[PDB]
RNA sequence: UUGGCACCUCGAUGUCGGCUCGUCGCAUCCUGGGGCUGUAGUCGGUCCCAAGGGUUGGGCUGUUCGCCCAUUAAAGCGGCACGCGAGCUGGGUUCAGAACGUCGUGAGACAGUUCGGUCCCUAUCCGUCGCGGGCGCAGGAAAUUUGAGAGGAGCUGUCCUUAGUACGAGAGGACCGGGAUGGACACACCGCUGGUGUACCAGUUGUUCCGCCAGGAGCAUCGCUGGGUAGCUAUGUGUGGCAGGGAUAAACGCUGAAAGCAUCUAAGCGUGAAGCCCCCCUCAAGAUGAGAUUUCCCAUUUCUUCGGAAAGUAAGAUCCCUGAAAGAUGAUCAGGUAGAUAGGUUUGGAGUGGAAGUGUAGCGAUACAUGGAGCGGACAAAUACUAAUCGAUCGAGGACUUAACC
């Protein structure tokens, strides 16, 4: 596995942040090295989602960030990233065995020449 | 490796009973003393069981004459005539290395 | 003198009839074919050229296909020559099975050692460290490059550089078991290379 | 530690024989009709040359 | 796995309580001694009124070590502590009794009198 | 070595000892071969050949040296700026402080002592160790290779037997030969024994957070603690220096004159060292002397009076992309849908050690059940779900002379 110029705890924080971003936004632009690490972590969260039971929900909850995706209005209640993973994202990949993400190469960033990519759910 | 599993399968001793670390076992070990082959009982607590297939080993600890002695065996060695589980211990971990520092009473394993 | 090419599958152990426990390397040697016989008349030396593992057509080229067509076989991953063999044995296109060896046969295993990349003098040449304390600023360094007089460094001053990936021959390994239906040799002890490494097994020169 | 002699123009230029860029790996797209890096998305069309987005 | 300056409990009846290894015998640059090896040692602690006295330079055979011994069958033996027995040039012990268990490797090396006196030979 | 001289260096050639790394000489310490012996044997003495390899760890002292302890086959002597400070150390010496003895009226000083006291530097060139790119090698390619030449290796103990024989009055006690098993060293490898294992499992403290409980997360050295996979590893395991061959050294001879004898030598034959050259291991055709074998592609187009030129291609290779058994980067190797190359997924496995939820028992901490459970980086096998799309670029057309077949 990749060390992304970060200590162990910094790297876990980064992976959790990006994992949540990809579940929330469904399409993010990041560096190639980050995307090639994110696909592993996000596809395992979607697997937990497909599993669906309380034990898997709590394994996902230990990783996913406590972020509000949106407010739906029934009274109006927020929707949390974990709820989206288990209620929105997971089910759409019910019949698809793996390969929930794809990485499109974009081009180098101006300020540091970093090779940027789109990683997206599909 | 599937091919190494197939090649070694024959050497697996099926007589080996189910034991875990914490179990008291009596190892009937064959001993070549000069010319004739003897049977020497080594009875103690199973301290460790590591590895896979024909490479699997276990280690038995006893206090002989006030000195801790650890005997490590291949599980499937044919130099063990018989391995009998005397009592099932209640332990909370796979490796009982903490027993190496404890002497009688403090080193007692509860029976199940 | 007999020889074969196999891949290193991995290491395990076997109990002998005695009761002793010995470490073994499992060499899988399926699909060895005799491709070409070199004679003193043609090439200036006696050798049999053995092709080892079958290879997908698209991974071969027309030069390769033409060479193995002479022996009515498919392209081969590895091709190696064996010298000191009897050319009366070996027909072109003949399979070379592991039963050319028997239990107790003493063999020499040749392969390429595992790659360690750029390595210092401590790991690469087993040199001594300088002191780690007592004011020392010398720890994993190569030692003096030499005396002053020859205003230069002599030619075998051992220094850091790429470490493994060299051809190695381990001499006098006993064959412990020979399984024809599995195309498996069990060789006592270890042979050079990572798992899946090419290993050349031939009869011990000594 | 320090240069014993200044480096001549010739020697400096020889050293720089290998200090150069390579041409980028590019090719004309069919749908766009303009150059693009292989294995990248073409911005002119606005998607991956093959896979529509 | 005993070297110069290694201290050992004396597992016998002679005066010696503790010895310090002066030299591993049998080789110009031989670093380590194992079970059944003879070492030259000095007596650091004595039992008052014992035969062997403090400061005496003696030969001792190592009868058990924390670094154990491998056996050809593929089994190992390891003890809780390093003990030795003080011997004459003929491999007989200076003492009359041997204390604690003793490794079978002694019987092979031909320390027959020690093997006989030992309460257990593992 | 102690010295003599003052020739290089005072716009600086760092000076003792140690460490690291060695390399060379032989006047040889050990091991090999041999002559003489005041050589019975076992031990020795002395000389000759021999530099292949080997040649210990401690106590004291800044030490070198030396003495001592314990080993060893042996603990060699020298050179390399008393080898090696842009490699290290800095105890000693050779700075400022202070003190003692001593000398000096004194400031201060030492055939002396004592405690303390800044060791800078990003490597240009050659050199050394690794690793690429270019072109060459009378066509262009893909493999397999010969070995000119080079490097590596080269050590040695003990026990048993021969044999209590030979030898000796006894005491003691062999050569030669055969076998076993070590030390040190080297190479490989992780199945074993262990080590490590910061994206594996578990326990646990404080505090903050997830609204609360439950269950979790953050931070505290990875918070700490007990384990541990792959990988990397030694202290672990396997293997090696086996046995030879050729020519020699000292030496021993045979035949043999010169010199009717004698004489190993002049002609001529043989024996004969761990040494030389092979044998063993590795690199090696830039070996420009550019070698060999097998296989593949073929003689295209337009020009150039002319020689030649350029421009599409062949076999083949590369860019680019997925990577690891490879790796600083290049490179190498495995793959690119003619698809298991990587990720995911599904089954496993190691490892951990019994999840959550629920229930039962208990006043409760907790225990038990459901259930070798749950988790499970890097390991295994399947699976085309995701990404290896689509492209492009480079790359022959083979000079002349002579001979032989023909
Ligand atoms: Mg932390
Ligand atoms: Mg590597
Ligand atoms: Mg050292
Ligand atoms: Mg340091
Ligand atoms: Mg010169
Ligand atoms: Mg003058
Ligand atoms: Mg100057
Ligand atoms: Mg000489
Ligand atoms: Mg000097
Ligand atoms: Mg110095
Ligand atoms: Mg210098
Ligand atoms: Mg006075
Ligand atoms: Mg001072
Ligand atoms: Mg430097
Ligand atoms: Mg430079
Ligand atoms: Mg040359
Ligand atoms: Mg291991
Ligand atoms: Mg391990
Ligand atoms: Mg907490
Ligand atoms: Mg709570
Ligand atoms: Mg804070
Ligand atoms: Mg004569
Ligand atoms: Mg001869
Ligand atoms: Mg030798
Ligand atoms: Mg695979
Ligand atoms: Zn396009």
mmCIF file of C-alpha atoms (C1' of nucleotides) in Angstrom, chain F residues 114-365:
data_model
loop_
_atom_site.group_PDB
_atom_site.id
_atom_site.type_symbol
_atom_site.label_atom_id
_atom_site.label_comp_id
_atom_site.label_asym_id
_atom_site.label_seq_id
_atom_site.Cartn_x
_atom_site.Cartn_y
_atom_site.Cartn_z
ATOM 1 C "C1'" U F 114 47.599 17.293 37.707
ATOM 2 C "C1'" C F 115 41.836 18.501 36.660
ATOM 3 C "C1'" G F 116 39.474 21.181 32.348
ATOM 4 C "C1'" G F 117 39.409 22.514 27.420
ATOM 5 C "C1'" U F 118 35.418 24.697 19.395
ATOM 6 C "C1'" C F 119 37.939 18.147 14.741
ATOM 7 C "C1'" C F 120 35.004 22.997 9.090
ATOM 8 C "C1'" C F 121 33.891 21.720 3.783
ATOM 9 C "C1'" U F 122 26.869 20.869 -0.900
ATOM 10 C "C1'" A F 123 32.701 16.377 -4.864
ATOM 11 C "C1'" U F 124 34.534 19.869 -10.546
ATOM 12 C "C1'" C F 125 38.282 16.224 -12.461
ATOM 13 C "C1'" C F 126 40.706 11.469 -12.274
ATOM 14 C "C1'" G F 127 39.990 7.072 -9.296
ATOM 15 C "C1'" U F 128 36.536 3.345 -7.123
ATOM 16 C "C1'" C F 129 31.412 0.696 -7.051
ATOM 17 C "C1'" G F 130 26.772 0.289 -9.456
ATOM 18 C "C1'" C F 131 23.230 1.764 -13.440
ATOM 19 C "C1'" G F 132 21.442 3.894 -18.197
ATOM 20 C "C1'" G F 133 21.751 6.472 -23.215
ATOM 21 C "C1'" G F 134 24.573 6.682 -28.075
ATOM 22 C "C1'" C F 135 26.986 4.651 -32.017
ATOM 23 C "C1'" G F 136 29.789 0.677 -33.748
ATOM 24 C "C1'" C F 137 30.220 -4.543 -35.218
ATOM 25 C "C1'" A F 138 29.136 -4.010 -44.688
ATOM 26 C "C1'" G F 139 21.262 -5.849 -44.746
ATOM 27 C "C1'" G F 140 17.401 -5.565 -40.845
ATOM 28 C "C1'" A F 141 15.641 -8.622 -36.655
ATOM 29 C "C1'" A F 142 14.433 -12.559 -32.139
ATOM 30 C "C1'" A F 143 16.619 -16.117 -29.117
ATOM 31 C "C1'" U F 144 20.549 -19.633 -27.757
ATOM 32 C "C1'" U F 145 25.744 -19.419 -27.050
ATOM 33 C "C1'" U F 146 31.942 -20.121 -27.587
ATOM 34 C "C1'" G F 147 35.404 -18.001 -24.130
ATOM 35 C "C1'" A F 148 40.401 -14.426 -25.505
ATOM 36 C "C1'" G F 149 40.478 -12.291 -21.041
ATOM 37 C "C1'" A F 150 39.171 -11.195 -15.936
ATOM 38 C "C1'" G F 151 37.354 -11.787 -10.832
ATOM 39 C "C1'" G F 152 35.984 -15.262 -6.810
ATOM 40 C "C1'" A F 153 37.379 -19.497 -4.039
ATOM 41 C "C1'" G F 154 41.978 -21.659 -1.744
ATOM 42 C "C1'" C F 155 42.195 -22.145 5.969
ATOM 43 C "C1'" U F 156 42.236 -25.742 9.612
ATOM 44 C "C1'" G F 157 41.057 -28.885 14.490
ATOM 45 C "C1'" U F 158 39.536 -33.157 17.170
ATOM 46 C "C1'" C F 159 37.958 -38.076 17.563
ATOM 47 C "C1'" C F 160 37.615 -43.328 15.825
ATOM 48 C "C1'" U F 161 40.111 -47.126 13.176
ATOM 49 C "C1'" U F 162 44.817 -49.146 11.255
ATOM 50 C "C1'" A F 163 47.226 -50.470 16.601
ATOM 51 C "C1'" G F 164 48.445 -50.506 22.025
ATOM 52 C "C1'" U F 165 50.851 -52.704 16.077
ATOM 53 C "C1'" A F 166 56.146 -50.515 14.367
ATOM 54 C "C1'" C F 167 59.763 -48.405 17.962
ATOM 55 C "C1'" G F 168 61.265 -48.966 23.081
ATOM 56 C "C1'" A F 169 64.440 -52.028 29.029
ATOM 57 C "C1'" G F 170 60.177 -49.550 30.618
ATOM 58 C "C1'" A F 171 57.759 -45.046 30.454
ATOM 59 C "C1'" G F 172 55.503 -44.051 26.597
ATOM 60 C "C1'" G F 173 54.005 -44.512 21.423
ATOM 61 C "C1'" A F 174 53.876 -43.437 15.474
ATOM 62 C "C1'" C F 175 54.437 -42.901 9.795
ATOM 63 C "C1'" C F 176 51.440 -44.208 5.649
ATOM 64 C "C1'" G F 177 46.095 -45.348 4.689
ATOM 65 C "C1'" G F 178 40.659 -45.401 5.861
ATOM 66 C "C1'" G F 179 36.325 -43.132 8.336
ATOM 67 C "C1'" A F 180 33.375 -39.703 11.353
ATOM 68 C "C1'" U F 181 32.507 -34.932 13.238
ATOM 69 C "C1'" G F 182 33.800 -29.658 14.402
ATOM 70 C "C1'" G F 183 35.774 -24.218 14.352
ATOM 71 C "C1'" A F 184 36.332 -19.971 11.427
ATOM 72 C "C1'" C F 185 34.874 -18.235 6.637
ATOM 73 C "C1'" A F 186 31.603 -17.848 2.162
ATOM 74 C "C1'" C F 187 27.067 -18.217 -0.888
ATOM 75 C "C1'" A F 188 21.848 -18.953 -0.979
ATOM 76 C "C1'" C F 189 17.121 -19.111 1.316
ATOM 77 C "C1'" C F 190 12.744 -18.360 5.047
ATOM 78 C "C1'" G F 191 10.132 -24.504 5.426
ATOM 79 C "C1'" C F 192 11.927 -24.617 10.819
ATOM 80 C "C1'" U F 193 13.653 -21.537 15.396
ATOM 81 C "C1'" G F 194 13.416 -16.468 16.468
ATOM 82 C "C1'" G F 195 13.518 -10.820 15.203
ATOM 83 C "C1'" U F 196 10.840 -6.904 12.881
ATOM 84 C "C1'" G F 197 6.254 -6.095 11.061
ATOM 85 C "C1'" U F 198 3.371 2.622 12.082
ATOM 86 C "C1'" A F 199 -3.505 0.608 6.826
ATOM 87 C "C1'" C F 200 -3.585 -7.191 10.842
ATOM 88 C "C1'" C F 201 -6.441 -8.954 15.619
ATOM 89 C "C1'" A F 202 -7.195 -8.159 20.726
ATOM 90 C "C1'" G F 203 -6.970 -5.809 25.848
ATOM 91 C "C1'" U F 204 -6.633 -1.182 28.402
ATOM 92 C "C1'" U F 205 -5.979 4.445 30.827
ATOM 93 C "C1'" G F 206 -7.142 9.799 30.438
ATOM 94 C "C1'" U F 207 -9.904 13.287 27.846
ATOM 95 C "C1'" U F 208 -12.766 15.210 23.495
ATOM 96 C "C1'" C F 209 -16.316 14.020 19.862
ATOM 97 C "C1'" C F 210 -20.305 10.986 17.074
ATOM 98 C "C1'" G F 211 -27.333 14.435 20.427
ATOM 99 C "C1'" C F 212 -27.877 10.385 24.799
ATOM 100 C "C1'" C F 213 -27.399 4.727 25.955
ATOM 101 C "C1'" A F 214 -25.085 0.964 23.585
ATOM 102 C "C1'" G F 215 -21.403 0.784 19.943
ATOM 103 C "C1'" G F 216 -17.534 3.622 17.825
ATOM 104 C "C1'" A F 217 -13.904 7.710 16.276
ATOM 105 C "C1'" G F 218 -9.717 11.573 17.511
ATOM 106 C "C1'" C F 219 -5.286 12.743 20.482
ATOM 107 C "C1'" A F 220 -1.761 11.097 24.133
ATOM 108 C "C1'" U F 221 5.825 7.773 21.332
ATOM 109 C "C1'" C F 222 2.021 3.412 16.731
ATOM 110 C "C1'" G F 223 -1.000 6.489 23.964
ATOM 111 C "C1'" C F 224 0.345 1.958 26.423
ATOM 112 C "C1'" U F 225 0.132 -3.422 26.678
ATOM 113 C "C1'" G F 226 -0.281 -8.911 24.561
ATOM 114 C "C1'" G F 227 0.114 -11.303 19.899
ATOM 115 C "C1'" G F 228 1.149 -11.253 14.591
ATOM 116 C "C1'" U F 229 0.651 -11.816 7.990
ATOM 117 C "C1'" A F 230 3.470 -10.748 3.619
ATOM 118 C "C1'" G F 231 8.072 -8.765 2.953
ATOM 119 C "C1'" C F 232 12.964 -7.982 4.874
ATOM 120 C "C1'" U F 233 15.999 -10.929 8.062
ATOM 121 C "C1'" A F 234 20.386 -14.181 11.746
ATOM 122 C "C1'" U F 235 21.411 -15.705 16.137
ATOM 123 C "C1'" G F 236 17.959 -20.009 11.863
ATOM 124 C "C1'" U F 237 18.399 -23.663 7.722
ATOM 125 C "C1'" G F 238 20.805 -25.731 3.229
ATOM 126 C "C1'" U F 239 25.314 -25.981 0.546
ATOM 127 C "C1'" G F 240 30.793 -25.040 -0.355
ATOM 128 C "C1'" G F 241 36.506 -25.232 -0.011
ATOM 129 C "C1'" C F 242 35.233 -32.767 -2.623
ATOM 130 C "C1'" A F 243 38.157 -35.657 -5.450
ATOM 131 C "C1'" G F 244 41.473 -34.997 -9.063
ATOM 132 C "C1'" G F 245 44.811 -33.817 -13.710
ATOM 133 C "C1'" G F 246 49.173 -31.435 -15.964
ATOM 134 C "C1'" A F 247 53.877 -29.112 -15.390
ATOM 135 C "C1'" U F 248 57.402 -27.747 -11.460
ATOM 136 C "C1'" A F 249 60.343 -25.919 -6.379
ATOM 137 C "C1'" A F 250 63.586 -27.754 -2.633
ATOM 138 C "C1'" A F 251 64.776 -32.751 -2.672
ATOM 139 C "C1'" C F 252 65.260 -37.957 -4.060
ATOM 140 C "C1'" G F 253 66.612 -41.099 -7.966
ATOM 141 C "C1'" C F 254 67.638 -44.015 -12.825
ATOM 142 C "C1'" U F 255 70.684 -44.510 -16.889
ATOM 143 C "C1'" G F 256 75.238 -41.933 -18.117
ATOM 144 C "C1'" A F 257 79.883 -40.039 -19.992
ATOM 145 C "C1'" A F 258 83.286 -35.638 -19.825
ATOM 146 C "C1'" A F 259 87.312 -37.930 -16.291
ATOM 147 C "C1'" G F 260 88.571 -46.868 -18.266
ATOM 148 C "C1'" C F 261 86.599 -45.318 -11.833
ATOM 149 C "C1'" A F 262 83.089 -42.476 -9.637
ATOM 150 C "C1'" U F 263 79.161 -39.012 -10.402
ATOM 151 C "C1'" C F 264 71.037 -37.215 -10.384
ATOM 152 C "C1'" U F 265 73.538 -34.057 -15.722
ATOM 153 C "C1'" A F 266 76.516 -32.667 -19.846
ATOM 154 C "C1'" A F 267 72.824 -35.949 -24.123
ATOM 155 C "C1'" G F 268 68.545 -38.831 -21.982
ATOM 156 C "C1'" C F 269 64.513 -40.869 -18.454
ATOM 157 C "C1'" G F 270 61.597 -40.635 -13.813
ATOM 158 C "C1'" U F 271 59.603 -39.380 -8.759
ATOM 159 C "C1'" G F 272 58.292 -34.791 -6.163
ATOM 160 C "C1'" A F 273 54.666 -29.195 -2.409
ATOM 161 C "C1'" A F 274 48.622 -25.956 0.820
ATOM 162 C "C1'" G F 275 52.452 -23.181 -4.237
ATOM 163 C "C1'" C F 276 52.119 -22.632 -10.733
ATOM 164 C "C1'" C F 277 48.418 -23.959 -14.845
ATOM 165 C "C1'" C F 278 43.818 -26.492 -15.115
ATOM 166 C "C1'" C F 279 39.647 -28.531 -12.696
ATOM 167 C "C1'" C F 280 35.114 -25.578 -9.196
ATOM 168 C "C1'" C F 281 31.948 -20.616 -9.033
ATOM 169 C "C1'" U F 282 30.822 -15.703 -11.504
ATOM 170 C "C1'" C F 283 31.486 -11.868 -15.300
ATOM 171 C "C1'" A F 284 32.908 -11.700 -20.211
ATOM 172 C "C1'" A F 285 32.748 -10.381 -28.292
ATOM 173 C "C1'" G F 286 33.422 -2.277 -27.207
ATOM 174 C "C1'" A F 287 37.677 -9.761 -27.680
ATOM 175 C "C1'" U F 288 36.730 -2.504 -32.727
ATOM 176 C "C1'" G F 289 40.565 -9.295 -33.199
ATOM 177 C "C1'" A F 290 33.227 -6.548 -32.375
ATOM 178 C "C1'" G F 291 33.205 -14.575 -32.905
ATOM 179 C "C1'" A F 292 29.357 -18.945 -33.495
ATOM 180 C "C1'" U F 293 24.419 -21.568 -34.028
ATOM 181 C "C1'" U F 294 18.966 -21.722 -34.865
ATOM 182 C "C1'" U F 295 15.015 -18.952 -36.669
ATOM 183 C "C1'" C F 296 12.414 -14.647 -39.015
ATOM 184 C "C1'" C F 297 11.911 -10.597 -42.971
ATOM 185 C "C1'" C F 298 12.786 -9.881 -48.143
ATOM 186 C "C1'" A F 299 14.894 -7.275 -52.554
ATOM 187 C "C1'" U F 300 9.424 -1.839 -52.634
ATOM 188 C "C1'" U F 301 8.459 3.398 -54.406
ATOM 189 C "C1'" U F 302 10.039 8.222 -56.236
ATOM 190 C "C1'" C F 303 14.760 10.202 -57.340
ATOM 191 C "C1'" U F 304 20.390 10.770 -58.311
ATOM 192 C "C1'" U F 305 23.919 12.110 -65.516
ATOM 193 C "C1'" C F 306 26.930 9.846 -61.599
ATOM 194 C "C1'" G F 307 27.985 8.084 -56.921
ATOM 195 C "C1'" G F 308 24.311 8.061 -53.668
ATOM 196 C "C1'" A F 309 20.071 10.634 -51.418
ATOM 197 C "C1'" A F 310 14.744 10.419 -48.906
ATOM 198 C "C1'" A F 311 10.051 7.950 -47.821
ATOM 199 C "C1'" G F 312 6.441 4.596 -47.178
ATOM 200 C "C1'" U F 313 7.008 -0.333 -45.101
ATOM 201 C "C1'" A F 314 8.702 -6.045 -43.624
ATOM 202 C "C1'" A F 315 10.373 -9.058 -39.607
ATOM 203 C "C1'" G F 316 10.867 -6.686 -35.174
ATOM 204 C "C1'" A F 317 10.947 -2.948 -31.571
ATOM 205 C "C1'" U F 318 9.360 1.437 -28.940
ATOM 206 C "C1'" C F 319 6.107 5.492 -27.106
ATOM 207 C "C1'" C F 320 1.671 5.254 -24.008
ATOM 208 C "C1'" C F 321 -1.008 2.333 -20.262
ATOM 209 C "C1'" U F 322 -1.828 -1.975 -15.894
ATOM 210 C "C1'" G F 323 2.080 -3.587 -12.864
ATOM 211 C "C1'" A F 324 6.216 -6.549 -9.576
ATOM 212 C "C1'" A F 325 9.182 -11.578 -8.778
ATOM 213 C "C1'" A F 326 12.376 -5.769 -10.661
ATOM 214 C "C1'" G F 327 13.647 -0.885 -9.095
ATOM 215 C "C1'" A F 328 17.128 5.724 -6.765
ATOM 216 C "C1'" U F 329 15.955 7.092 -11.970
ATOM 217 C "C1'" G F 330 16.717 4.712 -16.442
ATOM 218 C "C1'" A F 331 16.779 -0.509 -16.809
ATOM 219 C "C1'" U F 332 14.784 -5.570 -16.026
ATOM 220 C "C1'" C F 333 10.682 -8.835 -15.998
ATOM 221 C "C1'" A F 334 4.851 -9.892 -16.086
ATOM 222 C "C1'" G F 335 0.672 -7.886 -18.963
ATOM 223 C "C1'" G F 336 -2.301 -4.531 -22.366
ATOM 224 C "C1'" U F 337 -9.551 -7.466 -23.977
ATOM 225 C "C1'" A F 338 -5.689 -12.784 -29.015
ATOM 226 C "C1'" G F 339 -6.526 -10.113 -21.571
ATOM 227 C "C1'" A F 340 -6.044 -12.526 -15.008
ATOM 228 C "C1'" U F 341 -1.296 -7.142 -15.373
ATOM 229 C "C1'" A F 342 -3.367 -4.415 -11.157
ATOM 230 C "C1'" G F 343 -7.798 -2.973 -8.243
ATOM 231 C "C1'" G F 344 -12.538 -4.778 -6.858
ATOM 232 C "C1'" U F 345 -15.640 -9.111 -6.014
ATOM 233 C "C1'" U F 346 -16.328 -14.273 -4.395
ATOM 234 C "C1'" U F 347 -14.246 -18.426 -1.936
ATOM 235 C "C1'" G F 348 -9.928 -19.658 1.072
ATOM 236 C "C1'" G F 349 -5.405 -19.046 4.232
ATOM 237 C "C1'" A F 350 -2.194 -17.062 7.942
ATOM 238 C "C1'" G F 351 -3.158 -14.066 12.297
ATOM 239 C "C1'" U F 352 -6.094 -12.731 16.328
ATOM 240 C "C1'" G F 353 -9.142 -15.349 19.956
ATOM 241 C "C1'" G F 354 -14.708 -15.472 20.630
ATOM 242 C "C1'" A F 355 -17.805 -9.414 17.065
ATOM 243 C "C1'" A F 356 -22.335 -6.688 17.127
ATOM 244 C "C1'" G F 357 -27.238 -7.494 18.244
ATOM 245 C "C1'" U F 358 -30.232 -10.420 21.183
ATOM 246 C "C1'" G F 359 -31.149 -13.633 25.167
ATOM 247 C "C1'" U F 360 -30.207 -16.011 29.940
ATOM 248 C "C1'" A F 361 -27.949 -15.769 35.213
ATOM 249 C "C1'" G F 362 -26.406 -12.190 38.703
ATOM 250 C "C1'" C F 363 -28.261 -6.543 43.272
ATOM 251 C "C1'" G F 364 -23.822 -5.414 40.375
ATOM 252 C "C1'" A F 365 -18.830 -5.556 38.315
#
